[PDB]
Amino acid sequence: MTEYKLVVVGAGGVGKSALTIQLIQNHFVDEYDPTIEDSYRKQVVIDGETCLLDILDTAGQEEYSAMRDQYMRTGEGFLCVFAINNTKSFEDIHQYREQIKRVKDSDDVPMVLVGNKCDLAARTVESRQAQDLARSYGIPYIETSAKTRQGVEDAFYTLVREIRQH
């Protein structure tokens, strides 16, 4: 039984917690309660391998971000989340990637770019924009909805598959 240590990062309110909770707990969190640092663990079979997913759900609100860097350091792969209706959250991905490089002291860190809230029609980040960013980092881009489940399992299992490529 292999353990994979996943860390979910991104601006406040983009849906890190909703994504994680939909994956692990099979419901949609409608309310917004800012996270400090939460962990989830679940045993799951991914591509025929029994493994233990340890998912760190981090703070995106600066006021709740104390020690986020030390929590992030442990991670093996990162889900870099923005919301497709929040242009600034997408623009913030660059500094999240730079923070990841710093906490890992590496420029070769498993990552997946996730554009969340794809059930909403107030899109201000077009797919191709995000595809291009991901391409520049050598990683996949996946759209998700924590509300409908679209892409949710795919996004997390893709990050496990990126860790396996490292």
Ligand SMILES: Nc1nc2c(ncn2[C@@H]2O[C@H](COP(=O)(O)OP(=O)(O)O)[C@@H](O)[C@H]2O)c(=O)[nH]1
């Ligand atoms: N419609 C919709 N709302 C979402 C989605 N993901 C998150 N939200 C909402 O966005 C808000 C912030 O989500 P949350 O997961 O707490 O954000 P976090 O700060 O990134 O952890 C909450 O009101 C969620 O219900 C999504 O895929 N679709």
Ligand code: BEF
């Ligand atoms: F949990 Be979120 F980043 F407010």
Ligand SMILES: [Mg+2]
């Ligand atoms: Mg949260």
